[PDB]
């Protein structure tokens, strides 16, 4: 499978689904991180908060 490791739980759902993270940066969808089946990896892009600093 192109998605990857397809496996079912006791509920018959999907396991280890990779997720994409988007930030609304000036009304444009900019990728800011990726999600593994168990861990989150931010990308090289920065994320701006509604206020000031990126922290």
């Amino acid at each position, epitope marked *: 499978g192109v998605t990857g490791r397809v496996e079912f739980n006791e509920d018959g759902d999907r396991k280890f689904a990779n997720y994409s993270i988007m930030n609304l*940066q*000036n*009304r*444009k*969808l*900019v*990728q800011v991180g990726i999600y593994n089946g168990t861990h989150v990896i931010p990308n090289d*892009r920065k994320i*701006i908060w509604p206020g000031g600093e990126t922290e």
Partner: antibody
Framework: QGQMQQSGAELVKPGASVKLSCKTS????????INWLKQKPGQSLEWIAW????????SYNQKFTDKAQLTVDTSSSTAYMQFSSLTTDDSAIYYC???????????????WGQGTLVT | DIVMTQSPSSLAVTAGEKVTMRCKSS????????????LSWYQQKQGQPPKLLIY???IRESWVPDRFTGSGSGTDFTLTISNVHAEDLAVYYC???????????FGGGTKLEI
């Protein structure tokens, strides 16, 4: 290299509707932005609307918010613009273009269709 | 819509000379937080899709030769060619890229003649 191919020329009666197609290829169809522009002959292009294929987010020009509708087909990677209540003012050339974004920053329309004339 | 003012409207020069084309926006295209100008210079030749020439009012594209020089900041911007060639003959447009300043608008344009 990405390619955008538009539909052929249309002769539409006034007050009727036309739905134009714009097949896209050579790039990530889901993660890009496509814009429809109205260009009358001898005139500059008029921005109509933009749509994001990954989220179905739609934004139209106020002049065309009640006139044009946009749809996409992920299986075919083809953009669609349906122009309804057509009038003689709509006798113009419509173009579909793919946005060029560098380092996450928009840098202008880098790809274009061949153009479609609606009479 | 931010009004983009381009000057001159058209010009004709001999090969080898230096030209200057100005772009003026009705509003400041500079965002204070990042101090970047949302201005893009383009080269549009007859019968072809426009080719992105300079973005950020100062940065040339990879395919753009060093002879092109974009300057200006805030509301006023300038496109300058140090060594004008015959191939450069085209109509050049400056367009704002500020997402908070939608919709995107274009200036009047400058026609280059040789």
């Amino acid at each position: 290299q990405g390619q955008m191919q538009q539909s052929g020329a249309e002769l539409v009666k006034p007050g009727a509707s036309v739905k134009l197609s714009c097949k896209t290829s050579g790039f990530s169809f889901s993660t890009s932005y496509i814009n429809w522009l109205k260009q009358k002959p001898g005139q500059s292009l008029e921005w109509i609307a933009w749509i994001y294929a990954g989220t179905d987010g739609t934004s139209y020009n106020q002049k065309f918010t009640d006139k044009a509708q946009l749809t996409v087909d992920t299986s075919s990677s083809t953009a669609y613009m349906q122009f309804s209540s057509l009038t003689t003012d709509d006798s113009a050339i419509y173009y579909c273009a793919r946005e060029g974004i560098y380092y996450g920053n928009y840098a202008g329309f880098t790809y274009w269709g061949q153009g479609t004339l609606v009479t | 819509d931010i009004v983009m003012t381009q000057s001159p409207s058209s010009l004709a020069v001999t090969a080898g000379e230096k030209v200057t084309m100005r772009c003026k926006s009705s509003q400041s295209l500079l965002w204070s937080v990042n101090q970047n100008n949302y201005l893009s210079w383009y080269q549009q030749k007859q019968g072809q899709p426009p080719k992105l020439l300079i973005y950020g009012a100062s940065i040339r594209e990879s395919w753009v030769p060093d002879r092109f020089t974009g300057s200006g900041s805030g509301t006023d911007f300038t496109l300058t060619i140090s060594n004008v060639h015959a191939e450069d003959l085209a109509v050049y447009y400056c367009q704002h890229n500020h997402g908070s300043f939608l919709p995107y608008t274009f200036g009047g344009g400058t026609k280059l003649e040789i």
